[PDB]
Amino acid sequence: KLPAPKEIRTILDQYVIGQERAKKVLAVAVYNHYKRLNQRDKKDDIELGKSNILMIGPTGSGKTLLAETLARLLNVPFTIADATTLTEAGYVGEDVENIIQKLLQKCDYDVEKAQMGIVYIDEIDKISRDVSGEGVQQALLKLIEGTVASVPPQGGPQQEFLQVDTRNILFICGGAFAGLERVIQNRSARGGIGFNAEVRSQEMGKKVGEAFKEVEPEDLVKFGLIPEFVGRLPVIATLDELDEAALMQILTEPKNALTKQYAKLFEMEGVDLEFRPDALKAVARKALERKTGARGLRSILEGILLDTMYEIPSQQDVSKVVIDESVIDGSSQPLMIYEN
Amino acid sequence: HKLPAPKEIRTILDQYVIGQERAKKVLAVAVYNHYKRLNQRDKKDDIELGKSNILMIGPTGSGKTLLAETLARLLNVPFTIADATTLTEAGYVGEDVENIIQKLLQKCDYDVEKAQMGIVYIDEIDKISRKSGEGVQQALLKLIEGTVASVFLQVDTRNILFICGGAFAGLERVIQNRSARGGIGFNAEVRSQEMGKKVGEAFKEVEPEDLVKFGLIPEFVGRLPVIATLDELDEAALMQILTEPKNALTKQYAKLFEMEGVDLEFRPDALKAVARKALERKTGARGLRSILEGILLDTMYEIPSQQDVSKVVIDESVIDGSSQPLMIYEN
Amino acid sequence: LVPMVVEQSARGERAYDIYSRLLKERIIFLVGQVEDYMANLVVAQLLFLEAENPEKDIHLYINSPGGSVTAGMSIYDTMQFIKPNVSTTCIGQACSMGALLLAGGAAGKRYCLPHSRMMIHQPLGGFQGQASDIEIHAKEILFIKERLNQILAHHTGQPLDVIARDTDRDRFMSGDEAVKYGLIDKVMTQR
Amino acid sequence: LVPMVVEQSARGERAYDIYSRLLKERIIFLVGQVEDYMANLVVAQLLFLEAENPEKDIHLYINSPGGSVTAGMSIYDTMQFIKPNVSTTCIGQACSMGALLLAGGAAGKRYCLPHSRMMIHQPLGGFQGQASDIEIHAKEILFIKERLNQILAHHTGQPLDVIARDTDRDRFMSGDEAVKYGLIDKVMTQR
């Protein structure tokens, strides 16, 4: 109950590796949000307005993880609804109502739980700029600020529809705004081309290191988002790119680190899973070029472990499997101590 | 739970399926871990590992059911094969989503002991694609999470391995978009007109993102840490399959001629040509049926016409479509 | 004026000029004197079509009285380097570079209309300067003459001694005569 | 006329000219005599491509009979300043200024077609005036000649004395000859 922002930060830090800026923002944000649901006394202090957050980070930065991990600290219904599916009324496509509908399915159709729920609408950037654009934004505007639910009944007339007010729920929004770096580059040192220009470092996961630190509402409006929409979300969180230095600190440090999980499965048979410092770094580089980041580690690792994971059980007396940098690439095979 | 080693799993399964050993390797260790790990976790340090659900994606007549059957042939635990089209809203417009758990009650024998290790399998999961539709997916996803729900008999939903496999239509085109194209130069590598036309674009390399793009609920798409990749067919494997089953196509053809008292003599040479015809029609193992069924039509209209037709010899010319069945009619 | 054409594709209607519409079908037009600017367009078209479909054949129509040798070589070298087979169809005249580009097409894909006229002559050159400079340029024009004769022999199969003898003076060859000579493979008469 | 082309991208269909479409692939074309107006386009194109992908290589095709020395220097100086490797693939001919750009490409990325002629000649200059002006304008054309000789020696690796000797008179070099000289790295024939 109402854990201190610092405690939340430490718990979230267990998995997240290097999101301090957003960590604090997200921590304080939820902390005060639930204090409003808690501070319901009648002392002329119910007027308090919620403040929705707008998480902007390159794909795979850790946005979803923060939302999901934080949901567990709350121990209440949480959901993630994509923004692409939603389309303005009058044309085929998901209706804004549906967001509440699916959200309530996780809540078990409990009004108290609904009001104390958190949303993580993703890919908000997609709906930028007659249909699938401003229309969706206009509809969403009312929904995020204030609206009554119309969720039809489950299982089993038209009056059966249930209602709940969308003025308590914290509607967090996560989006990978492709091109925002150029908008923020126009703020100062607009030069992209020329000898004395700010030409991008590279076309790898180094580009957006701290490019969103200087994100202002004006840029988001220029991006295409409605001015009103940008106003609705006052807080704007920023995430890093999870580059090679991050990926090296994310393959063993996290409590859920792939190496740890893989080691657990290997430990059962009796093989002491081992990794070399350079070996782990090698995987990071391979994931960055592949552009799969976080999601590329598992696959990459499975391509380097599964091979010997089908052998190890049939082999006996195995004591260790040393994974060398060479093994990561397609040159060598996992070194294994066949006997003791 | 059988729970053999990956080696034993693959080897024992190879006996009944030829050509799908690549995917087998992955699935072998996959299921091996799930049973062993969960059953005897012994409160492992920093337990994070979620149910080792494995996805199955293959085209029609790829042997999805065969791999599902062979997997369930020796598995003592129940498999409760079910469908995704049969599911509808939760007892509002039609069949409820608890019917998958109802199929488990039949296979588990009402034994909680068997229920907890029930390998809930589904086929043609690609027919509920969002465009009921998306509603069934969410009501389906609820059980994937491992939410104990009775049908009435309480059923253990935790630790239920999911090997669901659908014949996703338009999967390669979505992963084809992800693939990059070649340049236009004198020192550039134009690799092909198209990229998902030489190898199955879908079943060589897949990431969760590609599945979300298809139009599936992102939560369910990122619910399976493991995946698989089924190979449509193989030319070598097509000649073995021709007479591998107990009642193989060729076998059944001869057995049908034998009902009248005629032998269906067939040449090895003809077999090679037959495989090519099926590979061109691109309709899977089942496709081969149509080629021979038509070819035999003439023989199914000649043997009856002439009685005392001892046997019929088929040569490579007959499969080429030039020669006429060499009636061996005699005394 | 160049007329406009509508493709009326399934996705929607599009407007392309008469030349661009044919370019979609892997067709390239060579009209007028050969020069660096127009020759560069052909090279760009050949490479672009290669990326679209490196297996489908390409058809190059040639109607030109000749031109720059260097510009022509850039086209010939490009046709052989790329993977697709660049067909060639004479539509009435090829004097010096038109026949080198007509005879530099894939085997079995060199055509000519019924009343087309094809000629072959040695490369003409013009230069002025000191005696030393003249001797240097003379060797260059003599080297080019040999390389060009070698190309015709390779594609036509005739011996180099015959090519050099036939290129000393202007030699006109009809559609039927060219087939026996080896410059082309077939004479298209009707569909 | 320049034919149009459609990319047919996922976002939609856009019409690009044959030259603009190739520009998206980091390709620049240098055709005709070198001059301030045409050379400035290459500068803008090279700089523009640097921002899109400062790591991906660039392919600069050179088919030109030469031109302004000052205009060419802006291209060479720009190619070396930028980070991306600028490949060179000589098609057709490469005269004095064209050869310098061909030699200025990244190491191991300089190419030429089989029937390509690479000529090297001294810088051409013309001026009229008093004896004092002639003496002043003679040191400039002589100083520039030294800079160009150093550039070729740096990339080709040959000693400066050999460059001056060869540049005294026109010297035509084929693909194979240019490789030994160091002007290029490989002669491409077929894909």
Ligand SMILES: Nc1ncnc2c1ncn2[C@@H]1O[C@H](COP(=O)(O)OP(=O)(O)OP(=O)(O)O)[C@@H](O)[C@H]1O
């Ligand atoms: N891998 C295989 N090995 C041998 N026979 C196969 C294989 N795959 C398909 N077949 C043949 O296909 C026939 C049965 O087809 P089946 O109904 O299993 O299609 P399916 O693969 O289940 O379709 P889907 O993939 O859409 O579920 C059998 O006669 C069988 O011989």
Ligand SMILES: Nc1ncnc2c1ncn2[C@@H]1O[C@H](COP(=O)(O)OP(=O)(O)O)[C@@H](O)[C@H]1O
């Ligand atoms: N620091 C991290 N530690 C562990 N896992 C991470 C980390 N960053 C990202 N991930 C993984 O990446 C996946 C993608 O989620 P996220 O990066 O939040 O946004 P998106 O889903 O848009 O890529 C998550 O499932 C998560 O497990």
Ligand SMILES: [Mg+2]
């Ligand atoms: Mg995620």
Ligand SMILES: [Mg+2]
């Ligand atoms: Mg079946």
